[PDB]
Amino acid sequence: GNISRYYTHWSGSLEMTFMFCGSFMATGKLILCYTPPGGSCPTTRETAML
Amino acid sequence: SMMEINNTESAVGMERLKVDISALTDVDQLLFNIPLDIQLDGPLRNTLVGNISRYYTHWSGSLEMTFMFCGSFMATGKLILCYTPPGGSCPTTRETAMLGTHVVWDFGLQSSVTLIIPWISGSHYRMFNNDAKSTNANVGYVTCFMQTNLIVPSESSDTCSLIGFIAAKDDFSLRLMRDSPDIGQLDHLHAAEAAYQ
Amino acid sequence: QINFYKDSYAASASKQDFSQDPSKFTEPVV
Amino acid sequence: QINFYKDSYAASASKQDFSQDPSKFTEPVV
Amino acid sequence: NLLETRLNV
Amino acid sequence: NLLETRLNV
Amino acid sequence: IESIIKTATDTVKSEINAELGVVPSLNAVETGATSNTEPEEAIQTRTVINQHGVSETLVENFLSRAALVSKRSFEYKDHTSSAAQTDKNFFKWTINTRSFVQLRRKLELFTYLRFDAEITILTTVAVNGSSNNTYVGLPDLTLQAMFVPTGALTPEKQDSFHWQSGSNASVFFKISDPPARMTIPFMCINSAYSVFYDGFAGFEKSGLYGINPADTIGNLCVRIVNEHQPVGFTVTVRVYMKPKHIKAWAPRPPRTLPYMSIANANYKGKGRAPNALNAIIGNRDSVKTMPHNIVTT
Amino acid sequence: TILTTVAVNGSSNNTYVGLPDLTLQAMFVPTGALTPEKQDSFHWQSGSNASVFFKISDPPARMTIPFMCINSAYSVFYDGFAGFEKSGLYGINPADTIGNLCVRIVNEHQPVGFTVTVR
Amino acid sequence: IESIIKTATDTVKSEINAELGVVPSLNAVETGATSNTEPEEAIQTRTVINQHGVSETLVE
Amino acid sequence: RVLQLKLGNSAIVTQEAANYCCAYGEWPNYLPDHEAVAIDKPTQPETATDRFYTLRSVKWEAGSTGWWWKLPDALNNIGMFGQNVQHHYLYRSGFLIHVQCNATKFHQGALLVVAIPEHQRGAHNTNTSPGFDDIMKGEEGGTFNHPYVLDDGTSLACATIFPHQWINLRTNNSATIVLPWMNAAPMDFPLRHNQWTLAIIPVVPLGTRTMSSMVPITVSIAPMCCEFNGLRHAITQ
Amino acid sequence: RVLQLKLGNSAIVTQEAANYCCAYGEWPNYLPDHEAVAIDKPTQPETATDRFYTLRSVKWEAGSTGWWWKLPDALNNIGMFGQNVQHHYLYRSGFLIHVQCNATKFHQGALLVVAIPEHQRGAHNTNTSPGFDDIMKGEEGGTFNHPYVLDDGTSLACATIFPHQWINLRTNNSATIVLPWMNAAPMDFPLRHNQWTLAIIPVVPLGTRTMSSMVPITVSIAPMCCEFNGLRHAITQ
Ligand SMILES: *[C@@H]1O[C@H](CO[C@@H]2O[C@@H](C)[C@@H](O)[C@@H](O)[C@@H]2O)[C@@H](O[C@@H]2O[C@H](CO)[C@@H](O[C@@H]3O[C@H](CO[C@H]4O[C@H](CO)[C@@H](O)[C@H](O)[C@@H]4O)[C@@H](O)[C@H](O[C@H]4O[C@H](CO)[C@@H](O)[C@H](O)[C@@H]4O)[C@@H]3O)[C@H](O)[C@H]2NC(C)=O)[C@H](O)[C@H]1NC(C)=O
Ligand SMILES: *[C@@H]1O[C@H](CO[C@@H]2O[C@@H](C)[C@@H](O)[C@@H](O)[C@@H]2O)[C@@H](O[C@@H]2O[C@H](CO)[C@@H](O[C@@H]3O[C@H](CO[C@H]4O[C@H](CO)[C@@H](O)[C@H](O)[C@@H]4O)[C@@H](O)[C@H](O[C@H]4O[C@H](CO)[C@@H](O)[C@H](O)[C@@H]4O)[C@@H]3O)[C@H](O)[C@H]2NC(C)=O)[C@H](O)[C@H]1NC(C)=O
Ligand code: NA
Ligand code: NA
Ligand code: NA
Ligand code: NA
């Protein structure tokens, strides 16, 4: 973010990485979605998973 | 060239160029010390190395000090000459000063001895600020002590003299030229108008 | 280095003589 | 590129070193 | 000044 | 003047 | 023995010594030679490869810098009522290196010098500030500088027929130009200039000591070429000299006491140290006092 | 690169009059060394210091200063005290200070005042 | 490992994956290394020849 | 995951590591003859100085902001390393840093462990620079005032540009970092400049619902390739 | 007759020596692997410890009996040698000893300078053994009670069987002796056993009819090939 704001045009892929910081005995599953542009941000799992 | 070690209020003209020594009744005593900062005013300033260095701003390399004994042939003694790298106060006792770089000198048929001041610096060059206590400028200290005593017979002079000399070695270098602080004027000189007549 | 003048004394400075002999001042003895 | 000065530090900018190694910041592990 | 000497007045 | 002739007036 | 030197000398690693008949730290100052003791002989050293250059202390670099040698101010006006001593729209100057102390001390480090001289002339103007005058703008005047040999005839007035310059070199320049520039060759009757001269340059006993006219380069005669305007101005001319193509012989003890005169080496010194006649270095309380001693707390 | 501009002083005694083409001197002086005390000082003789002389009607003045540090690089940040005693400022190393510029107008003053700005 | 880089990197075509013992989208942030997961390992890609220059971000 | 470190008369074992970090991909070494400046033969003590020293432990509390130590300052009075520092004008070394913290499978929390080169601190809400006693803490170290801006007006979020590891209590119980010499000069005066700052910051706070116990954090540091020049009488801080 | 000695950052010159003595014809060295006992890697400080240290000078008086110092005891609190001694269980070294005394061509006198291995002292006119404070003098050294029997019931006349030189004031102004490691074991605990004793004894007393001056005697000692084993926390005497 900081380096890109010295420039005006950009291109290429990004990566997001997440770390879980609960206890060893904690369990769960999550779904992470990226939605290409065109309308409103999705509010439901069955919309976002497309 | 000669160091002005005796830069004191009571020493007049040529007297400033020699150090007098005499017999002592206590062991291990301090004789004199010399500040080493070759940019500043002090015993080193009016020398061939001092005068040329003050046209520049940065310097590097080793120095040598040489001392000549000028007592009678019948006079005897031993001295210790020490160089202390920087970090704190100048040493006041022989058992402190002997932990640094040093030479022990015996008076004899050879009249003179050399102390090398080796280049020991964190940076490639030292730098002429107008601040003697800077980590980029300070060189440390030279000190002289009795190793034995000055011992002479009754027909010799009871007081004898040293002349001290300094020069650079061929590892020495200078850079960043400037107007010298050793000369200046507030007016035109006498007869300067005659060049326009 | 650019010099179109006819007299050689017109030229720019000469900064390339690295020769030395300190011994004529430091060791003038037999 | 035009430079008639005698000291090399007088020259124009140097825009031609394309060498990289991201791994000294992205992968500093055994 | 402080940029030449690192001392405050 | 003295620089041209080395005589004083 | 002569050799080519481009960097400071390297250091070699060294070991313990204990050896009868060998004493490299002892010397004989009475011979007049400098001590030949090396660092490797005085202490244990490491190996060091030294890349420090030595070119900024070359004699050509040390002396070849443009330095101020003359500054003259005069009034540009109708001079009909001026006194006999006034510079009436022109002046004479004899070229010398004796008048401004930074160049004088540097040249006096040597006994003999051979060089060509590059001359640069800078001009500035201002409106005369007496209470009759408002500001009006500044004129772009033409000036003439004529070279005249040492002791030869010079112009007597601004409009003299001597300014026709039939064999003398003249340079004409405007205030709106870059500064004027030209080179004067090494002109001495000898193979080098004498910086110091221990003699009397005449067959009779009567004249000045220590000045040899063979070392005086020449004269510049300078005028404004324009006629006077209805209002007065003050014009200032500055001359700079740069030595080039230099050879130098027999180095000397530097000047310590202030200069008194352009004509001689006469001396007096400051009233108190430093640079007083009886004390060159500033005082300390005793030979045991360390003047900038570090205090730790 | 050094850029200079001028304007007539705007106090109620003054009309506009045009602008002078002044000469300026900029002298390089090393960190902590002696600097001039007045406009007409004998220190401006510049016998070994570099000086540049330039006019307001010229293009801006330009020159290059070399990498001058006593170390192999400048320190942008410095976690220390650059003196053997405990007393001075944190975080400033004078070895990273390049030097001084000393700047004057070379002309004598005119009968009327002006304001000069140097960038 | 040092190399000469004048343009942004190309993309290679990729297929379906289903493979035991292999999980290129999982990482260990605690080591202090940045994630090495590539686009070809996360989605099906096409081939792309990338001609975008990198000279305007040179330190000089 | 499993590691043993052995220097001089000292050894450390861990059963829950996460590889280890070599700062900028570089390893400690002695000063070569083509980079050297001081001409005296150096002191090289080997196993007398190049060994693990362990500092006082600190307690991880619910309200903790984080902790810091400056090098070489934190070691300048410890063992034969401290004695060689006090008798010489010049010093040079690398370091190997090992940070230790354990808890149960029912605890949670995460520490950033980071080595910062030339960490020049700022003061909060004043024009006056930090004093000598704000900076020179010795063996005890200090605490962060505003860890979110690293006490220098920058940010914690971008601190991952420096050499670092994490301790995440469900994953690992230790962090290890190897540091080369890092300075503009080949050697330095050890009593006035610090090359590196170790910082430990609790980005996710300690938590559990099991039995309460005191949870310490412990730091062990080994100098590597030590050299000293300019021998004289002793000076302390 | 002329000699220069150079170790670490220290040098000594003399213009009036009388050769020098190597004890039993042997020179100092490090402990080889076929003679070693302790298995830890040793500390070898080189130029930090292997350099000249100078002690307090003593005055030569008309009634003087002579002077002595014990090694390593006289150096156990000096510089980086003293710091390495305080932090390690085991020590080993040789020594180079230089003794200095000058006077005029009108003075007369002679000193025996002798190095005694295992100089176990006796007390005079009692059955009780010497106490800890009779033996352990440190840097100041001691004086002889009965130099004619070496304070041990033997004799001064036969002391020439040990490594020695003389200072005879008409001939020379210095004496020099080189000492190897001399013990039944390869290393020792430095705070409880002394390998060597330096003794200086005025066999012909100082005399002149010229002007009276104070005539000091000065001792400089350099450790050689120092090694230390069994690193831990500091213990002093
Ligand atoms: C370099 O040194 C500077 C001088 O330091 C002082 O003088 C030397 C000789 C020693 O005695 C030293 O110990 C002194 O500190 C130093 O500048 C000084 O910096 C301080 C701290 O920032 C300034 O204090 C603040 O002052 C204002 C009030 O300012 C007015 O009054 C002063 C005279 O008292 C005038 O000089 C000013 O022009 C103003 O008219 C306070 O409001 C402020 O905070 C207080 O009030 C707030 C609420 O508003 C509270 O929250 C705070 O707790 C405070 O109670 C500070 O007290 C000090 O004014 C300033 N002095 C001068 C003469 O400039 C400088 O910082 C040093 N430089 C560096 C780089 O370190
Ligand atoms: C081992 O320790 C032995 C015991 O030491 C004493 O007891 C211990 C528990 C501590 O309190 C300790 O501090 C004590 O010293 C030690 O034996 C002792 O050694 C001393 C010194 O040689 C003896 O002193 C001499 O004693 C005689 C007198 O002897 C008669 O009286 C005693 C009782 O007081 C009886 O035990 C004897 O049998 C005799 O009947 C003195 O004449 C002599 O000299 C004094 O007189 C002369 C002139 O004649 C003067 O010039 C002197 O200055 C003196 O004033 C001593 O004072 C002591 O008797 C002896 N005690 C015993 C019980 O044996 C032993 O030496 C130690 N061993 C070693 C190897 O060190
Ligand atoms: Na300075
Ligand atoms: Na070289
Ligand atoms: Na002279
Ligand atoms: Na590409």
From TrEMBL, chain A:
UniProt subcellular location: Host cytoplasmic vesicle membrane; Host nucleus; Virion
Function: Localizes the viral replication complex to the surface of membranous vesicles. It inhibits host cell endoplasmic reticulum-to-Golgi apparatus transport and causes the disassembly of the Golgi complex, possibly through GBF1 interaction. This would result in depletion of MHC, trail receptors and IFN receptors at the host cell surface. Plays an essential role in viral RNA replication by recruiting ACBD3 and PI4KB at the viral replication sites, thereby allowing the formation of the rearranged membranous structures where viral replication takes place. Capsid protein VP1: Forms an icosahedral capsid of pseudo T=3 symmetry with capsid proteins VP2 and VP3. The capsid is 300 Angstroms in diameter, composed of 60 copies of each capsid protein and enclosing the viral positive strand RNA genome. Capsid protein VP1 mainly forms the vertices of the capsid. Capsid protein VP1 interacts with host cell receptor to provide virion attachment to target host cells. This attachment induces virion internalization. Tyrosine kinases are probably involved in the entry process. After binding to its receptor, the capsid undergoes conformational changes.
UniProt subunit comment: Interacts with RNA-directed RNA polymerase.
From TrEMBL, chain G:
Membrane-traversing stretches: none
Location within or outside the cell: Host cytoplasmic vesicle membrane; Host nucleus; Virion
Oligomeric and partner information: Interacts with protein 3CD.
Similarity section: Belongs to the picornaviruses polyprotein family.
Function (record text): Acts as a primer for viral RNA replication and remains covalently bound to viral genomic RNA. VPg is uridylylated prior to priming replication into VPg-pUpU. The oriI viral genomic sequence may act as a template for this. The VPg-pUpU is then used as primer on the genomic RNA poly(A) by the RNA-dependent RNA polymerase to replicate the viral genome. During genome replication, the VPg-RNA linkage is removed by the host TDP2, thereby accelerating replication.
UniProt-recorded name of the protein: Genome polyprotein
Source organism of the structure: Human enterovirus D68 (EV68)
Automatic annotation (TrEMBL), chain H:
Location of this chain's protein in the cell: Host cytoplasmic vesicle membrane; Host nucleus; Virion
Function: Acts as a primer for viral RNA replication and remains covalently bound to viral genomic RNA. VPg is uridylylated prior to priming replication into VPg-pUpU. The oriI viral genomic sequence may act as a template for this. The VPg-pUpU is then used as primer on the genomic RNA poly(A) by the RNA-dependent RNA polymerase to replicate the viral genome. During genome replication, the VPg-RNA linkage is removed by the host TDP2, thereby accelerating replication. Capsid protein VP1: Forms an icosahedral capsid of pseudo T=3 symmetry with capsid proteins VP2 and VP3. The capsid is 300 Angstroms in diameter, composed of 60 copies of each capsid protein and enclosing the viral positive strand RNA genome. Capsid protein VP1 mainly forms the vertices of the capsid. Capsid protein VP1 interacts with host cell receptor to provide virion attachment to target host cells. This attachment induces virion internalization. Tyrosine kinases are probably involved in the entry process. After binding to its receptor, the capsid undergoes conformational changes.
Family: Belongs to the picornaviruses polyprotein family.
Subunit structure: Interacts with protein 3CD.
Protein name, UniProt field: Genome polyprotein
Organism: Human enterovirus D68
Full-length numbering of the shown residues: 684 to 802 of 2188
TrEMBL record, chains J, K:
Cellular localization per UniProt: Host cytoplasmic vesicle membrane; Host nucleus; Virion
Signal peptide location: none
Role of this protein: Protein 3A: Localizes the viral replication complex to the surface of membranous vesicles. It inhibits host cell endoplasmic reticulum-to-Golgi apparatus transport and causes the disassembly of the Golgi complex, possibly through GBF1 interaction. This would result in depletion of MHC, trail receptors and IFN receptors at the host cell surface. Protein 3CD: Involved in the viral replication complex and viral polypeptide maturation. It exhibits protease activity with a specificity and catalytic efficiency that is different from protease 3C. Protein 3CD lacks polymerase activity. Protein 3CD binds to the 5'UTR of the viral genome.
Family: Belongs to the picornaviruses polyprotein family.
Subunit structure of this chain's protein: Capsid protein VP1: Interacts with capsid protein VP0, and capsid protein VP3 to form heterotrimeric protomers. Five protomers subsequently associate to form pentamers which serve as building blocks for the capsid. Interacts with capsid protein VP2, capsid protein VP3 and capsid protein VP4 following cleavage of capsid protein VP0.
UniProt protein name: Genome polyprotein
UniProt organism field: Human enterovirus D68 (EV68)
